[PDB]
Each structure stands twice: as C-alpha cells, then as structure tokens.
C-alpha cells in the first residue's frame, strides 16, 4: 500500500524554569529515524535509524535549526496560551504538535496532516482541504483567524506537498531495505 512520515513535537513548561523541555521524535512508517532532546548535551538533531546519517551536514544543520526554532516558538506559545486561558505560572502545561504527509504507492501525494493540542485536548487542526482550519475551542479561533491572515493554510500546504513528500520519498529510497520489510 501507501507510506507516511510523521514528526511528533512536545514542549512542556517546567515552572520556575526559564525554558521548557522539548522532545522531537520522527518516524517513517513505523521506523524512527531522528531525535532532538532538549535535556540532551548534544543541542543537535541526532540520528536514530541506520539510513539517515548518510545525509551529510546539510541535513543535521538543517534539522537542528528548524526545531531549535520550533522549540523557541513553543516557548512563546506556552506563554501566549497562558494568557488566552487566564492561567498562572505555577502550572505546568504541555503543547503537542503533529504534522506529516502520506505518499502513495507511486510516490504520489495522498494526504497531509497538522494537528495541535494544548494539554491533550484538541486545539487547532488542519482540514483535509489544507485550505481550512478547524478550531476545537474558543482560544483556537483567535489562532484560527490569526493564521488565515498570513495564509498559513498555504505555507503549511507547501511544506506538505514539497519537502515532506520529497523528504519521505528520499528516505524510502535511502533506506529502501529498512522501510519496505514485513
């Protein structure tokens, strides 16, 4: 059948700690390949599969900044959502982002994904159209109408059909042994 790629982000605020803890886990189908741990001494995106470390420094330097910055954003997002919900700084809250894409049997594009959850409860989501957002609660509507202002429906749509499908396509052939097993 088809294939898939998923990135799983989690930013939890350690109250009384200046920066929250961050763990990023990437999977291709059901084979993890990358790791970025905030408390790790690396400060760098570490390989986790046997076929991803053949991607040279252009890849590890890329993936680090893209979620070094993804961790930074969630640092201001936990503080922004702390103001949306009238909540206090003694509380310890979690932010969970999952975005990914599905390729078909012929390298095609089949379906894209991006979902956000504040404390395990649905927040804002991406519709199949990839042109519409759905806000689960109220605070996700001040984020829904804020995102349609910068056309974030598109710039997520461009990552999903661009680097995500060509990333997933590039990995399915880089570790072609690992990813078509049974």
């Amino acid at each position, epitope marked *: 059948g088809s294939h898939s790629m998923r990135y799983f982000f989690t930013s939890v605020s350690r109250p009384g700690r200046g920066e929250p803890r961050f763990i990023a886990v990437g999977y291709v189908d059901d084979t993890q390949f990358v790791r970025f741990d905030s408390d790790a001494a690396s400060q760098k995106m570490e390989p986790r599969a046997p076929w991803i470390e053949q991607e*040279g420094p*252009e890849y590890w330097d890329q993936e680090t900044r893209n979620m070094k910055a993804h961790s930074q954003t969630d640092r201001a997002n936990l503080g922004t959502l702390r103001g949306y919900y009238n909540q206090s700084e003694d509380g310890s809250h979690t932010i969970q982002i999952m975005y990914g894409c599905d390729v078909g049997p*012929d*390298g*095609r*594009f089949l379906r894209g994904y991006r979902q956000d959850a504040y404390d395990g409860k649905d927040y804002i989501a991406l519709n199949e*159209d*990839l*042109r519409s957002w759905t806000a689960a609660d109220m605070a996700a509507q001040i984020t829904k109408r804020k995102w349609e202002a910068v056309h974030a429906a*598109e710039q997520r*749509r*461009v990552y999903l*059909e*661009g*680097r995500c*499908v*060509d990333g997933l*396509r*590039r990995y399915l*052939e880089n570790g072609k042994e690992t990813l078509q097993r049974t």
Partner: antibody
Amino acid sequence: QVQLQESGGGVVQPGGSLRLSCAASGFNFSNYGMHWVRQTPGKGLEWVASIPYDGSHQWHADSVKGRFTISRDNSKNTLYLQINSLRPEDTAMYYCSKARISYLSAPAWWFDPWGQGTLVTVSS
Amino acid sequence: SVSTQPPSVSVAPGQTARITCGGNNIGSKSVHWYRQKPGQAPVLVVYDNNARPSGIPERISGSNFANTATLTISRVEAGDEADYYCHVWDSSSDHVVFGGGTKLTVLG
C-alpha cells in the same frame, strides 16, 4: 505516475485558429492548477497562460493576451489552449505542466512535472 | 520581472559548476530550477531556493539570498549537460518569470 500528453499541434497558416489539448493522468486533476508554457526552438522558456484547479479565473501572459484563451475540462482530465489569429510568432513548442501544490488561487509555485509538448509552426 | 542567467557555463568533469539567476529582490522570491536536455521536457531539480526533489542527487544544490540565486552542481557528470532555467513569480506583475537559460557544458 503523473502523465501529460499534448496533441493537436502541427503546421498551420497565419490567421487561422488552433486548439491545443493536454491529456492528464495520475492525479486528481480536479484539485490542481494547470499551465501552458511554450518555447520557441533554440530559445528560452516562455510562460503562456495558466488556470486554477476549477477554471474560475484565467491568467494570461501579455505576449498572448486577447488572442489566446485557456480552459479545462475536469470531467475529461484534459487541459486546452486556444490560439486565435495565428502569427509567425506563435511558432513554438507548447508544454503543459501541473502545478505541484493544490488549490492555488494564482500560478505562483513551481511547475512539476512538464509534459513533452506539441509543436506549432506557421508559415505561408 | 527580469531574471538574467549566464548564456553558457563550461566545466571539467568531476569539478563544481555554478549557474546564477540574478534579479532585483530575487532573494525574497521563491526560485526554482529546471534542467532541459535536447529533445526532452524541463525537469525540476531545485524548488524554493534550496530544496531538492525526490530523484535529484545531493550533488545539485540551490541557493538564494539578497539579489542573486545560485544553482550549484558539485562533481559534474556528463549527464549534467543541458540548458538550465530558473523560475520565479513576480507578485507585482502576475507573470511567472523564467531566466534566459544557461547551456551547461561538461567538456570532453
């Protein structure tokens, strides 16, 4: 397995009208925009026209505006380019290409993949 | 709406080739690259400044900053001989703008 097949071209005389057609297969054609980009032999690429996924609007390059009209038939998965009042300048190869990203309200992002194209040559 | 490429680039096998696509504020546009060999259709090799498609080998890399986009082909093979067109969208023109094209020659 995105596949594009141009046809309908050939050798015509100036003043006549011509209809190019691009047959598409290997994707939900109703969800992507389509483009026509022509190339005069021995010269660079030149954008002609483009149409969003639905046919709502119709984008024209200035070099072919008023004379050309681009349309699409989603039920047949076929893209059409109509050329009116053929001139020696319309002598070029006409590629048809499928916008990578979906639902584009404007032809802004890269074109992948390109069809092999059809050749239109006019003379007396 | 004017993006200008060198007419041709000659490079020794195994060396590193470099094709430019100069343009006013092209660093703020999304540059793409197509390689057209004689008798075939153009093929996407670099999109959104630096991203590579699925089939493209990592030797070919993109670049785009300030007023100069750069296509870089490291370890040039004989199969890299073709014309190369960059692709932008002039927001303030409603015109997709190809460069003049560059005939990359890997001399034998």
